[PDB]
């Protein structure tokens, strides 16, 4: 369910952000989304550990 989080973006899906916004800000939005997903994955890994 953490994959359906906006994490400060317009939407939780990435293709809409890629095909809608300009690449200078789309790159930043995808970077924020993937670093939020990585933080959630690291939290899940720590809990599993």
């Amino acid at each position: 369910k953490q994959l359906s989080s906006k994490f400060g973006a317009i939407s939780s899906v990435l293709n809409d952000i890629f095909s809608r916004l300009d690449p200078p800000e789309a790159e930043v939005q995808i970077d924020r989304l993937i670093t939020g997903r990585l933080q959630s994955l690291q939290t899940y890994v720590t809990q599993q550990l």
Binding site: D22, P23, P24, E27
Partner: protein, 50 residues
């Protein structure tokens, strides 16, 4: 940027590590008669790679 020149004439990628330099010249590029020595493309089959 998406436009007319930036789409079919000269496209810039997301990463450039640079910029452009522009200035206005209304004397050297303009003559008394019609100056039609410049042509640009607006019709194309598909997009232009940068």
């Amino acid at each position: 940027q998406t436009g007319n020149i930036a789409d079919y004439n000269y496209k810039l990628p997301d990463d450039f590590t640079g910029c452009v330099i522009a200035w206005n010249s209304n004397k050297l590029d303009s003559k008394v008669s019609g100056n039609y020595n410049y042509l640009y493309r607006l019709f194309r089959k598909s997009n232009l790679k940068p």
